[PDB]
From a paper:
Among them, TNFα is a major inflammatory cytokine with a crucial role in the pathogenesis of inflammatory autoimmune diseases via interactions with its cognate receptors, TNFR1 and TNFR2. TNFα is a trimeric transmembrane protein; it can be cleaved to release a soluble trimer. Certolizumab pegol has a unique structure compared to those of the other approved therapeutic antibodies against TNFα. It is a monovalent Fab fragment of a humanized anti-TNFα antibody and lacks the Fc region.
The crystal structure of the uncomplexed certolizumab Fab fragment was also determined and refined to a resolution of 1.95 Å with R/RFree = 0.147/0.179. The certolizumab Fab presented a canonical immunoglobulin fold and four intramolecular disulfide bonds in the structures of both its uncomplexed form and its TNFα-bound form, as expected. The electron density of the structure of the uncomplexed Fab fragment was clear throughout the entire structure, including in the complementary-determining regions (CDRs). Additionally, all CDRs of the structure of the uncomplexed certolizumab Fab fragment had the same conformation as those of this antibody in complex with TNFα, implying that this antibody drug maintains the CDRs in productive binding conformations prior to interactions with TNFα, thereby contributing to the high binding affinity to TNFα. The elbow angle of the certolizumab Fab fragment, defined as the angle subtended by the two pseudo-dyad axes relating the variable and constant domains of the Fab fragment, did not differ between the TNFα-bound and the free certolizumab, despite the intrinsic flexibility of the Fab elbow.
Author numbering:
A (entry chain L): 1 to 213
B (entry chain H): 1 to 220
Write the structure that this text describes.
């Protein structure tokens, strides 16, 4: 088969930057190369065919170049909605083969998270389990640390985090940390605290509640 | 406009089969062939083959030849992919994508998730993430729904039957040590709206035929 190799695997660039990603074919494929844009949870969208021609509807800031084995895709002026994984593909010969994709992230100014904590509902407590949720909303960069304490005992191994994909409009992230305990354990303790560390915060922000208040 | 709608995916046991359908509209079905492409979670795109829609002649990637087959119902403008003797490694999002033989694929279906597992389907419990009583007067408040303990993916979540979209974050599900998924969907709103505006998260877990509307309000 023909292998398609893309570089870099990921890149970060600011709005308005000119950005170029590359695709190398293991054999001559003429100009029989297409590029696709895939946004989170969506189907790939066709951008370019025969290495350099735009599908109709595709914004003019997208372009492609190359022939033989070396191909490029360029975004002349990166926009927040261009956050996506970009794939090259050859159709010189079957089987059709794709590169592993290049993940393009938007670089923006630092934005501190807004933090919220949610106690377990009484409904859930009836089922024998308590989930405590800490929300970090609309922050940048993605790196954040969340620390759980229950009556000043550090909680390790009983929380899971999930992060949203970068927002297509403001280029921020949001993050949930969910602490799970038994009902019995939940009711043995008073102070539930979520401590957040992030570049946009001069010192860690703690949100907390006392059970029953 | 050109539309490709996939169905027939979802949960299937190892050793089992599914038959995916790709229903086309907005163009003359037999004027273009159809490709099938899959994408395992977190991985790249893998072309599985192409079918000639005018006479029904399929071409397969060597990796799936024999075990997967393509067929048509032109009267329904529909292409099918029957996938057999499945294994965990076949768990992926499956796409149909319109196109000529040996050429680019200019329109893709939305994709359907196939989960190969011997575990049973399980619908989610939906719990409120109640807005804080300490929410800032004249400020912004957060609330949400915890959608817990379901299998397999996916679930959809909307707010107020789709009327509320601004400020919504529905988090990627996480697999719990129980083998069940869980996620939260949250939204930020004006603090002043709490107790006046109704906030309902609409949850639909198709594999278990579980639809739940959960109202989220301040706790008393």
């Amino acid at each position: 088969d023909i292998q398609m190799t893309q570089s870099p695997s990921s890149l970060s660039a600011s709005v308005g930057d000119r950005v170029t990603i590359t695709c190398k074919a293991s054999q001559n494929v003429g100009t029989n190369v297409a590029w696709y844009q895939q946004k989170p949870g969506k189907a790939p969208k066709a951008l370019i065919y025969s290495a350099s021609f735009l599908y109709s509807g595709v914004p003019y800031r997208f372009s492609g170049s190359g022939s033989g084995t070396d191909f490029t895709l360029t975004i002349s002026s990166l926009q927040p909605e261009d956050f996506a994984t970009y794939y090259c593909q050859q159709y010189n010969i079957y089987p059709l083969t794709f590169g592993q994709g290049t993940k393009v992230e938007i670089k923006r100014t630092v934005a501190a998270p807004s933090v919220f904590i949610f106690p377990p509902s009484d409904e859930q407590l009836k089922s024998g389990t308590a989930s405590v949720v800490c929300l970090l909303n609309n922050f940048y960069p993605r790196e954040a640390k969340v620390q759980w304490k229950v009556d000043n005992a550090l909680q390790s191994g009983n929380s899971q985090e999930s992060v949203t994909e970068q927002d297509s409009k403001d280029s921020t992230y949001s993050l949930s940390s969910t602490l799970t305990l038994s009902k019995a354990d939940y009711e043995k303790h008073k102070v539930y605290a979520c401590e957040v560390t992030h570049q946009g915060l001069s010192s860690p922000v703690t949100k907390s509640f006392n059970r029953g208040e | 406009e050109v539309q490709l709608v996939e169905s027939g995916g979802g949960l299937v046991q190892p050793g089992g089969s599914l038959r995916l359908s790709c229903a086309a509209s907005g163009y003359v079905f037999t004027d273009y062939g159809m490709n099938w492409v899959r994408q395992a979670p977190g991985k790249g795109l893998e072309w599985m083959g192409w079918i000639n829609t005018y006479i029904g002649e399929p071409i397969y990637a060597d990796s799936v030849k024999g075990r997967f087959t393509f067929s048509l119902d032109t009267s329904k403008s529909t292409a099918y992919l029957q996938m057999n003797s499945l294994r965990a490694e076949d768990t992926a999002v499956y796409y149909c994508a319109r196109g000529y033989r040996s050429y680019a694929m200019d329109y893709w279906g939305q994709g359907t998730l196939v989960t190969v597992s011997s575990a049973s389907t399980k619908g989610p419990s939906v719990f409120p993430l109640a807005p804080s009583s300490k929410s800032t007067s004249g400020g912004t408040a957060a609330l949400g729904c915890l959608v817990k303990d379901y299998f397999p993916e996916p679930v959809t979540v909307s707010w107020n039957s789709g009327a509320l979209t601004s400020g919504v974050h529905t988090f990627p599900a996480v697999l719990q040590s129980s083998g069940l998924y869980s996620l939260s969907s949250v939204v930020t709103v004006p603090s002043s709206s709490l107790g006046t505006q109704t906030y309902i998260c609409n949850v639909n877990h198709k594999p278990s035929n579980t639809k739940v509307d959960k109202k989220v309000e301040p706790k008393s």
